[PDB]
Design a protein around this nucleic acid. Structure first.
Ligand SMILES: N[C@@H]1CCN2c3c(F)cc4c(=O)c(C(=O)O)cn(C5CC5)c4c3C=CC[C@H]12
Ligand SMILES: N[C@@H]1CCN2c3c(F)cc4c(=O)c(C(=O)O)cn(C5CC5)c4c3C=CC[C@H]12
Ligand SMILES: [Mg+2]
Ligand SMILES: [Mg+2]
Ligand SMILES: [Mg+2]
Ligand SMILES: [Mg+2]
Ligand SMILES: [Mg+2]
Ligand SMILES: [Mg+2]
Lengths: 208, 482, 482, 210
DNA sequence: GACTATGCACG
DNA sequence: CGTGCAT
DNA sequence: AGTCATTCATG
DNA sequence: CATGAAT
């Protein structure tokens, strides 16, 4: 399922979780094969806060992560026997991209906390415009435009320099700050109960 | 090179970003035109492209690809799937897309793939788009900032109720059943007249949903409940008949089944009852539906309690099901649970905006011309000296300036005058122009009145709605009981 | 209700239909533009839709669907696959489509689905279309019978040789390798001067194929056999180098591989040699290729026969292969095995027809305009009399009869004058009209000369081919040996 | 894979072999459930004159016609045990449709001669035009007196399909008869067989490229 | 949104 | 076997 | 060119 | 368990 790094090296080696085969393929091309592996996520990732742990485990995307990271799941989980120094979630800069980042994160919190609390889980920041700009703010400042509809229409030369190059890339580090404020947050947004989510949405989402 | 963010914060911006979008911009219909953004883009694009009921069908893929490149940046499959659905006459009370080719069945088999089918808008769909070209609805930029697309359609009929919507978002879902076009309009007309109409009275006109698949809807009490609060649970039961067969045996014959129900999977499940003998008495189950009739024979055994069986199939299969109103639409950019009242308020408010906007547009056109037409009538009175001034002018710019200065023409007239073709100098007839002046004056008065009199405006609304009804009205398919 | 047919008289008719069609209009290239019909449709279509190198990329699905609706009545997937290939710079010497996104790789992996990618014509493909707006090429009706499409393109360079073709039909197949643009033009240009050039002289200009993938080509004798008869067997061998390593170990590095060969598979089959110890001394195989360079490191063991290992990889893998010229193409509606000479002649033949057609078109345009410009010069000296006369006329038609009768203007001149906009009475200056008249006369003279003198027409054809060479010429990639 | 007839009857029942799923879907919809079965042929059919009987018995479509018509294959072929007295080939009117027919026929010829020779193997002629319907450019222009060019089967709508091609009453239908065993063995090998040269020749001799 | 198998000719 | 337009 | 799984709310 | 726009 996955395209692996050339050398096994739990100290440099990075796992790129890419949203879609489209981008999955542009990453295989754009990458540095020595220490960079690619694992496509084909479809919307299961929700590990809502699903029965029966199904949760009979799930292809979920199996090949437990098994591609090689540390096992839950508390049977040994961070010391890991396979990657970094784990990078690279999605489209769209909303469904956001949604996928969201489902992955809850899985890594629910079932591999060591990793999130160890600061090994990151999130890529692809550019939104083309010099390159990430914010509608740093754009008109660059007016001194090729709006990226998704990782798709980026070309390996660009993807490398902009977002995969360890020397040129911006890269968000996921960090549990308040264990209890984090469990509440996750369980409201992603849990079985609809009503509190709706409430949250009303309280926090500004429709204008 | 690297920035930390809290799990609590990262999950915040992400879910808020997506929640808002999938709510405002995907799963739930606007309360006025009744469309989800994908459907609007389909109709607006096909319409922009002249792919309309009165012209040949285009290849579905041409349409789909155009929608995808100009307006809706997503799966060519989703777009197609959406387009196919708006053409299935067992899912839409009044279909907005006409499709040549295998586009499915109630047996729920796949439609032909995009490469095979052909589509065009239906005539009724045109009515959803009516007057779009007269600046009657707010436009925004497409994902590209390269072309403007409409945010709501002019909706010359109350599509949201006529066709329904459904309906899965985040924090919110929607189920709105379809209704009879004639009934819905009758209510809207009654409410135009009586803004404060109570649900009880409105239901004299709009007694309940009307599925395109007919059948029986039971639950006047809950229909009311639903029209009041947007939620309610109703029963939908299949049209049945009993046929006596040769010597002792009877046959249950089904002719209409519940909306959103797959004929093939039903027939299977009814036969699974026979095969498991959960209830005693079934001899055979035969789907006998041909290309122009629905018919499922359930042949019973001799001495088989035919009420017992029919009751059992009603309970334990989809021969009968509960439909749940959960009418949520987008009003003011916000999700909102709504009943029959705010729905027609919104519609009517909307048609008001459209009719106002439309009349402002036409009036501005009649005026811009009436203005030119006045100037031309003047020119004739002084042709020789106006030609003389142009002869004497240095260029187009200068000529216009002199026309203004020497004879008080306005920029707009000076431009008309100066860009007349030479052969116009042949004419001397002021009368035709004066006739046009008159026709234009009358037209502006009529338009100005609509704009300036709530009543004049509302009678227009009513007049137009009634025309829509006279034209598209069709009998009930679904019967009502309590 | 029935009518019998012989099994013989029916496979006959059925297969003859498929045969002819798949030969003329699917699998084999036209000898002049070097395109298969689908390829020509993609090009002609994108061009009509203004989707060119100078303008934005356009979502791929939009181009495909338009092609499918207007010209090519086949699968969206076939059309896209074709379009993708035209954009891969390891299959075409000179790519005709530029594409944003994953369009594949030499590892044979799949390109991104049509919904993800953007595309537009390359600058050079524009030279394939140059002058199409000018009635320079025979058109035909599309399946709809609703729009005309070209049967061949103007081809401002010889695409059959430059990009190649390949090539599977019924009874015939085609394999034509790519060639260096400049070399091909140098050849063509020589043959223009020397209609009876023989393969040997042509080979002083066109020495052999130039693959986008590079590498070494061995077989001068066979290249000649191929350039003479259309068939030939030649050897292509990968470009290698030997790097020395610490610890006394040496290492083979591959940097160019043979055309039409899958890097990923090649790497496996080489590693397979190591695994099976088929030759002694391979340590490890690594594809070290990255976004800007092909590199296969084959690291050997200490004290290992490096020439022994390289010879084995050449013989027993695809590190070295045989390319088989089988140049067939479609000449006067028929499949024809052809060599360098029928090809280049057919091309010159075609470029002649185009250039002549073009010049007739432009001459007619210029004549018409000169004619109007001549009348306008006259009208200036009688400006006032002409205005007076038009004023005196009753309507537009009468104004023209007056202009003719009284001043001997022609219909076309009178119409021109009579439909001049008033402001034009301010640009009353003969000298710029007299300058246009002069440019026009010159232009007509130059074109008449082209039209009525083969030497002058070929000299144009040579000027032009050389401009294209100067503009798109690039260095050989594949080196030669015998 | 196969949509069966609602009632077994090796005396009335018909097998429709349809090019592709789309048209196979329209056929499911347009048929008469009681006596008409549908077996969609998805893709180009294996060449039974070129390929090795190994690959042939391993080919999905082939196996699911043999095990559908229920009479086995070759000389182990029992006509009296067929399931349909009418096997109908329904393809687009395009060239690739003409191709599929070519391939299907060489199958029945080579592996169910008993069937073709008993006048049981048919070819359905769908309409090319609709303005009523016309089947040949000639039959067409006569209707232009006192034109939806059907691009293929997947563009016709189930009620139309039934009326023009599937309804045994309102339908034109070719019957495939053998007239010269030897002269119809020669024609099949030139066209569908391993050796390429004879086929190239036959084309040059019989196809007018004009 | 990738995958599965055929035709066709040619070493 | 693998190519590339087709089903 | 059909098929496979997942999100999201609801009964 | 199925719904319909989305990966
Ligand atoms: N019986 C065959 C098994 C594999 N297969 C394909 C296929 F692999 C690819 C394709 C395609 O790539 C393809 C395309 O449009 O590109 C179309 N088909 C369908 C034949 C119509 C394909 C089919 C046909 C359906 C089943 C058959
Ligand atoms: N992990 C899943 C196995 C089945 N599946 C589908 C799918 F069933 C349908 C679809 C679609 O119907 C579909 C569409 O565009 O309509 C797209 N996909 C792809 C996710 C992009 C689908 C995928 C995704 C690939 C693998 C996943
Ligand atoms: Mg996306
Ligand atoms: Mg889908
Ligand atoms: Mg029930
Ligand atoms: Mg394909
Ligand atoms: Mg070799
Ligand atoms: Mg076809």
């Amino acid at each position: 399922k996955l395209t692996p790094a050339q050398s096994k090296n739990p100290a440099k080696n990075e796992l790129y979780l890419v949203e879609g085969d489209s981008a999955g393929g542009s990453a295989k091309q754009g990458r540095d094969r020595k220490f960079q592996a690619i694992l496509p996520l084909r479809g919307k990732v299961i929700n590990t806060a809502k699903a029965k742990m029966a199904d949760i485990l009979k799930n292809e995307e979920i199996n090949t992560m437990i098994y591609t990271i090689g540390a096992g799941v839950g508390a049977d989980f040994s961070i010391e026997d890991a396979n990657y120094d970094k784990i990078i979630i690279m999605t489209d800069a769209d909303t469904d991209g956001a949604h996928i980042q969201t489902l992955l994160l809850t899985f890594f919190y629910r079932y591999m906390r060591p990793l999130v609390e160890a600061g090994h889980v990151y999130i890529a920041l692809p550019p939104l415009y083309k010099a390159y700009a990430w914010t509608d703010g740093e754009l008109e400042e660059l007016r001194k435009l090729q709006r990226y509809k998704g990782l798709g229409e980026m070309n390996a030369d660009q993807l490398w320099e902009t977002t995969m190059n360890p020397e040129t890339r911006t890269l968000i580090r996921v960090t549990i700050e308040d264990l209890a404020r984090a469990e509440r947050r996750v369980n409201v947004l992603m849990g079985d109960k609809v009503e509190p989510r709706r409430k949250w949405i009303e309280d926090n989402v500004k429709f204008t | 090179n690297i920035q930390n963010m809290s799990l609590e914060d990262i999950m915040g911006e992400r879910f808020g970003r997506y929640s808002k979008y999938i709510i405002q911009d995907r799963a739930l219909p606007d309360i006025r035109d009744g469309l989800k953004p994908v459907q609007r883009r389909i109709l607006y694009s096909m319409n922009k492209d002249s792919n309309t009921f009165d012209k040949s069908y285009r290849k579905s893929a041409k349409s789909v690809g155009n929608i995808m490149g100009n307006f809706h940046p997503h799966g060519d499959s989703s777009i197609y799937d959406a387009m196919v659905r708006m053409s299935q006459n067992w899912k839409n009370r009044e279909i907005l897309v006409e499709m040549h080719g295998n586009n499915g069945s109630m047996d729920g088999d796949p439609p032909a793939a995009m490469r095979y089918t052909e589509a065009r808008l239906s005539e009724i769909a045109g009515y959803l788009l009516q007057d779009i070209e007269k600046k009657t609805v707010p436009f925004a930029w497409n994902f590209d900032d390269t072309e403007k697309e409409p945010t709501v359609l002019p909706a010359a009929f109350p599509n949201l109720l006529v066709n329904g919507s459904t309906g899965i978002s985040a924090g919110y879902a929607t189920d709105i059943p379809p209704h009879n076009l004639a009934e819905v309009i009758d209510a809207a007309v009654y409410m135009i007249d009586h803004p404060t109409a109570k649900i009880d009275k409105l239901m004299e006109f709009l007694p309940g949903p009307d599925f395109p698949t007919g059948a029986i809807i039971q639950g006047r009490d809950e229909i009311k409940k639903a029209y009041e609060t947007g939620k309610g649970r109703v029963v939908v039961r299949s049209k049945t008949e009993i046929e006596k067969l040769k010597g002792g045996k009877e046959q249950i014959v089904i002719t209409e089944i519940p909306y959103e129900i797959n004929k093939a999977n039903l027939v299977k499940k009814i036969d699974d009852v026979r095969v498991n003998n959960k209830v005693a008495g079934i001899a055979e189950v035969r789907d006998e539906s041909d290309r122009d009739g629905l018919r499922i024979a359930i042949e019973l055994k001799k001495d088989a309690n035919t009420e017992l069986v029919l009751n059992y199939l009603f309970k334990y299969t989809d021969l009968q099901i509960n439909y749940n109103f959960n009418m949520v639409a987008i009003d003011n950019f916000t999700p909102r649970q709504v009943g029959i009242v705010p729905i027609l308020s919104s519609y009517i408010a909307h048609r008001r905006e459209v009719i106002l906007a439309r009349s402002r547009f036409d009036k501005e056109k009649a005026e811009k011309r009436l203005h030119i037409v006045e100037g031309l009538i003047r020119v004739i009175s002084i042709l020789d000296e106006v030609i003389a001034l142009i002869r004497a002018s240095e260029n187009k710019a200068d000529a216009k300036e002199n026309l203004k200065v020497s004879y008080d023409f306005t920029e707009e007239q000076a431009e008309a005058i100066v860009t007349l073709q030479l052969y116009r100098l042949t004419n001397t007839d002021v009368v035709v122009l004066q006739e046009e002046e008159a026709e234009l004056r009358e037209k502006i008065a009529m338009l100005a009145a609509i704009i300036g009199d709530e009543r004049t405006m509302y009678n227009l609304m009513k007049k137009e709605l009634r025309e829509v009804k006279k034209k598209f009205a069709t009998p009930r398919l679904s019967s009502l009981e309590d």
